[PDB]
Paper text:
Three conserved acidic residues in the central β-sheet of the NTase domain coordinate with two metal ions (A and B) that are essential for catalysis. Based on sequence conservation and structural similarity, it is proposed that the cyclic di-pyrimidine-synthesizing CdnE proteins, including ClCdnE, EfCdnE, and LpCdnE, form smaller donor pockets that act as molecular gauges to recognize and retain the binding of pyrimidine nucleotides but weaken or exclude the binding to purine nucleotides.
The overall root-mean-square deviation (RMSD) is 1.38 Å between 280 matched pairs of Cα atoms. Other significant deviations were observed in the βB’-α3 loop, βD-βE loop, βE-βF loop, and α7-α8 loop. Despite the differences in local regions, the dispositions of the NTase and helical domains were similar in the native structures of ClCdnE, EfCdnE, and LpCdnE, respectively. Similarly, the side chains of Glu267 and Arg279 in EfCdnE are engaged in salt-bridging interactions and would have substantial clashes with the donor base if it were a purine nucleotide. This observation explains why we could not detect the binding of ATP and GTP analogs to EfCdnE in the ITC experiments.
Numbering used by the authors: 2 to 307
The structure:
Amino acid sequence: SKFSESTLSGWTKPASVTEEDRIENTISMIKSAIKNDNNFDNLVYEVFVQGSYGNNTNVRTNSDIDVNIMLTSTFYSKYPEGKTNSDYGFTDGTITYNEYKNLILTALTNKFGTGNVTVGNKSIKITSNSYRVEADCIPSLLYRNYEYENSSSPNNYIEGIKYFASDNTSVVNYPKVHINNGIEKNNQTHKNYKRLVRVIKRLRNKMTAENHFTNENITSFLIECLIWNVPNNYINDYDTWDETIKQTLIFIKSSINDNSYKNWTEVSGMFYLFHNNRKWTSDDVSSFVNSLWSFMEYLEHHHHHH
């Protein structure tokens, strides 16, 4: 085996939290910025953690926290065919996305300072030394998907989020559904699902750092989604991390080769993992898996000599 079980197990650990209450304090500081801004008094909204921190798959203490600020008193919707807002008694909305984003910008600027707020293409970066906030905030509107289960009941929908990037292109995600499904799979695998996610991400980083393989399209979200598609038996049936990773790579390769990967969803189940507008391709993932296979030396080198 290339790496000992102690080494692999170390690489399955969650990133240490240098500040014990970092997530809670970050959420609280952002919530405080909003709740004390009178212009949000008539609005209903949630501040919640998503991404690696939200899924407890973060592997680097230094990474920034993804925080969603989601407006819910005004929302977007996906309806069944032929239905409109008026079929659910809804208006087009009392506030637009851009107006909401500008209110958020004012609130965050009053809290953290104009020099510590930076609008990016996809999120608003807060770098507040004063309040200990290192966060990428995504202002979003709740996204009510009535079409997925064909619900005519206004209160029955799949809940996602929708925002507009700085180029005014639309982005729809289901971070809460993702988080819930990932928790479920962790519960079904004796907590080994997220351990596997973490070690694969760390091996990706190590392959990049040691000049074995680099591909900027192999994102942390992609890796999490790939491992989530690994059937629970490949995680529950083996007694070493070495073997678990070996079988994971065999399965992913086989699933790309036989085209079953085309039916894989992301963790949320609301979009397919591979399609023509993802950053990655199936070739990217095949390359990643092949390079990890060679890096782990699952085919032992001749005479155990590199």
